[PDB]
Amino acid sequence: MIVLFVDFDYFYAQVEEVLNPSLKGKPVVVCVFSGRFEDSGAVATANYEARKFGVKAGIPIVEAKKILPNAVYLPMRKEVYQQVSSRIMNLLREYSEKIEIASIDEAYLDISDKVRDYREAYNLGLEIKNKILEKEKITVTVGISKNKVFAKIAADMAKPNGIKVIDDEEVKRLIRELDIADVPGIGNITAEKLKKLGINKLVDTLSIEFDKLKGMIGEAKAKYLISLARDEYNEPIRTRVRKSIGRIVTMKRNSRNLEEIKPYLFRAIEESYYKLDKRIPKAIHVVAVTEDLDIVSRGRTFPHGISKETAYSESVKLLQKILEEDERKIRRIGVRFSKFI
DNA sequence: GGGGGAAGGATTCC
DNA sequence: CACGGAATCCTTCCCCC
Numbered sequence: 068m069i070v071l072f073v074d075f076d077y078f079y080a081q082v083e084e085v086l087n088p089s090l091k092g093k094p095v096v097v098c099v100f101s102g103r104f105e106d107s108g109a110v111a112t113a114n115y116e117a118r119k120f121g122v123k124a125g126i127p128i129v130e131a132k133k134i135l136p137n138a139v140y141l142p143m144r145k146e147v148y149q150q151v152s153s154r155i156m157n158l159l160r161e162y163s164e165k166i167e168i169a170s171i172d173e174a175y176l177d178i179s180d181k182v183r184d185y186r187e188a189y190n191l192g193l194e195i196k197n198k199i200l201e202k203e204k205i206t207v208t209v210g211i212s213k214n215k216v217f218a219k220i221a222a223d224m225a226k227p228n229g230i231k232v233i234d235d236e237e238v239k240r241l242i243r244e245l246d247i248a249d250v251p252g253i254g255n256i257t258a259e260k261l262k263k264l265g266i267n268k269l270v271d272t273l274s275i276e277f278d279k280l281k282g283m284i285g286e287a288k289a290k291y292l293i294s295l296a297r298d299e300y301n302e303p304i305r306t307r308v309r310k311s312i313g314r315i316v317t318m319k320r321n322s323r324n325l326e327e328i329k330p331y332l333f334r335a336i337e338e339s340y341y342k343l344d345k346r347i348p349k350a351i352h353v354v355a356v357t358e359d360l361d362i363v364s365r366g367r368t369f370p371h372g373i374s375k376e377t378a379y380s381e382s383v384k385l386l387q388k389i390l391e392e393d394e395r396k397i398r399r400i401g402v403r404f405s406k407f408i
Numbered sequence: 409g410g411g412g413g414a415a416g417g418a419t420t421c422c
Numbered sequence: 423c424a425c426g427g428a429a430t431c432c433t434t435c436c437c438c439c
């Protein structure tokens with residue numbers, strides 16, 4: 068089995084660049100302005116010119132300007148990036164039917180029944196990078212190996228604008244020398260939990276007693292890490308289907324006042340319903356980011372679809388249920404619709 | 409003992 | 423200061439064969 072993984076470079080910023088080539092070369096930071104104050108917000112992402120100086124995704128815009136006061140700060144435009152992604156995903160289908168669209172900017176292609184080895188795969192990769200650059204003008208990174216996880220790491224290592232082949236031999240080197248925290252799915256919190264067990268490489272998970280591992284990071288993670296370490300991990304390329312759609316917005320100021328929170332919640336419901344596109348959800352969740360940046364939610368599943376009118380009415384009750392069970396002030400509020408009909 | 413679902417929380421960035 | 427979207431997993435609670 069041969070898996071090919073494509074991941075677009077600094078995608079959002081790169082898109083802003085394609086839509087305005089004069090940006091090429093300058094540091095570009097795509098931002099999400101909350102509207103709390105002049106420059107309040109966070110960095111969506113930034114091109115490498117800016118990333119080399121510490122401006123990455125997540126930090127406050129304000130902190131970005133303290134580092135690169137003269138970089139180009141553009142507001143984030145999801146819709147556009149969304150349509151640019153789609154177009155690219157379509158070129159990929161022109162290489163395989165078995166394709167899993169993992170996110171807005173990466174996909175796994177099953178090319179096992181279309182190539183005979185890795186040198187011929189390395190070739191199909193260069194082919195794809197070129198077809199994407201020529202058509203949409205976007206540079207991507209390609210990762211190639213036996214399963215999805217290893218293909219992603221290959222990419223992770225070749226970024227940016229690269230292509231790497233992690234073959235069966237190297238898979239052996241990696242399971243030994245690979246830093247466990249560099250494995251897709253191991254975040255800082257799962258990364259630290261594994262330290263307390265003295266696990267620094269995939270191989271270490273083999274020598275610890277399952278029930279202990281299983282009781283430190285949960286059954287799923289554990290079996291996942293083990294199969295990888297044992298070289299017997301091999302999940303298939305699945306055609307993913309959206310199971311959720313929603314929107315969360317930030318308010319001008321924290322509050323626990325129902326009437327001054329509703330407007331944000333209703334707008335979230337409107338943009339939400341517009342994106343459903345013919346789809347009818349049976350479950351709705353009201354999500355709230357409290358003041359100490361802690362997330363809370365309250366949902367309801369219906370035996371039928373939810374009309375926009377029932378959405379408005381029901382979300383208000385769930386918000387009320389939130390302000391009643393939680394004493395904290397609310398910073399961000401939104402809605403999420405699921406269990407589509 | 410345990411299927412199956414729903415709900416609220418936790419974690420990754422896949 | 424610290425935005426935003428969505429998948430997957432964990433745990434407790436329920437209902438009940």
Ligand SMILES: Nc1nc2c(ncn2[C@H]2C[C@H](O)[C@@H](COP(=O)(O)OP(=O)(O)OP(=O)(O)O)O2)c(=O)[nH]1
Nearest residue numbers: 075076077078079080111112124125172226227426
């Ligand atoms: N709003 C927001 N968007 C994010 C965040 N992180 C990632 N994104 C979006 C914008 C990125 O362009 C897009 C693709 O994410 P990637 O992890 O692949 O990062 P990117 O492609 O930007 O750089 P990369 O070449 O992969 O190192 O995901 C975030 O924290 N907030």
Ligand SMILES: [Ca+2]
Nearest residue numbers: 074075076077
């Ligand atoms: Ca990317």
Ligand SMILES: [Ca+2]
Nearest residue numbers: 074170172173
């Ligand atoms: Ca990506």
Ligand SMILES: [Ca+2]
Nearest residue numbers: 248249253254
């Ligand atoms: Ca990591």
